[PDB]
Amino acid sequence: KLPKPVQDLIKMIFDVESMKKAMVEYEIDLQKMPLGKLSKRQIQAAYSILSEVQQAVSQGSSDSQILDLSNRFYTLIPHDFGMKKPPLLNNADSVQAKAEMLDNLLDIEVAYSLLRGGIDVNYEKLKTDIKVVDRDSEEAEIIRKYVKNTHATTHNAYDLEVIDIFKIEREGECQRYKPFKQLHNRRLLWHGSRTTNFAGILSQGLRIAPPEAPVTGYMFGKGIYFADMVSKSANYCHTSQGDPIGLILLGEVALGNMYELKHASHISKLPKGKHSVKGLGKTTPDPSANISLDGVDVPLGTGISSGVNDTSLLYNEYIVYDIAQVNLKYLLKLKFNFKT
C-alpha cells in the first residue's frame, strides 16, 4: 500500500540476512548465540564487563584479575575464533572493537525484538512517518547541493550517489523538541550509521552511549555527534562494495552557544551557559553559501580553509548531550561507488 522505495527501505533495515552476516563478521558463535537469544540484560551486562576490564586497562589488572574478567565476557557473548586461542581482552585496541560490537548488537536486538513481537506491519513498529521527497523538487535540489558540495577530498575512497530522499517525523519528537525549537543556532547536520542500527534509530531516536560503556574513543564525551561534510558521516555507514548502499540522516540540532574546542575533552557536564560542543576542523563549508530553511542553518558551501591551525580534527564535529536537542528531518538512501 506504501510507495515502492519506502517498502524497500523497511526490507533494508529489517533484513535478518544483514544481522546474521554482521555477527559472523564480529566472530560471534551463532550456534550458542543466535538472533532470538540476544537479550538487553546481556549487552548492558557485557558493557559492564567492559567497565572492570577498562577499570584495569590503565592500572593493567594482571591476568590474576584479567583472565576471569576477559573470560566472564564470553559467558554472555560467545565467539568462534578459527583454531587460535581466544583473543584475551587485555588492551584498549581490543576493547575498542568490542565497544563498537555491542554498540551494534544493541540495535540489531532492537530490530529483531520489533520484527519478532507485535511490511506495513514492520512500518507500524518504526513509529515513524516516512514520506518520499521527489527528485525534480526543490527540497530535493538543496539536499543534493549539500551532498555533492560538501564532499571532502580526504574522503577519496568513493563517489557519493543519492538513490532515494525520504522525509521523516518520529512519533513524539516534535513535542520533545518544542523546548529547543526556540534556541538560536539550529543546523541541518549529517548523521551516518550501519543500516542494522536504523531499526533502533527510527524507533528510539539517536541515543547517547549508556553509562556502563567505556572511557575514551569518545573524543568529546558521550553525546550525539553530527558533521557538516556528508563524507565524515558517510564513513560511519561502514559500507563495503559487497553492500554498496548506505543510510545517512539529516538532523535539525539546536546548538545554541557551541563550546568550541580543538582537542579532546571527555566533556562530562557542559559549562553553565553552553548547549552543544563544536570540534573546530581545518576545513569548513563556504559560510558565504549557508542557506536557510524554516530558521535552520543548512551549511552547504564547499570545503575552504577555516584558517584554524592547532586542531586535531580535519573537519568539524557537533555534539549535543540531550537527546531532545535533535529533531530528525530526512533519511537518505546512498550508493557508494568506490575508487581503486
Ligand SMILES: COC(=O)c1cnc(N2CCN(C(=O)c3ccc(-c4nc5cccc(C(N)=O)c5[nH]4)cc3)CC2)nc1
Ligand atoms: C579503550 O579506549 C579506547 O582507546 C577506545 C574505546 N572505544 C573506542 N570506540 C568505541 C566508542 N566510540 C563510539 O561509540 C563512537 C562512534 C562514532 C563517533 C562519531 N563521531 C562523529 C563525528 C561526526 C559525525 C558522526 C556521525 N556518526 O555522523 C560521528 N560519529 C563517536 C564515537 C568510539 C570508538 N575507541 C577507542
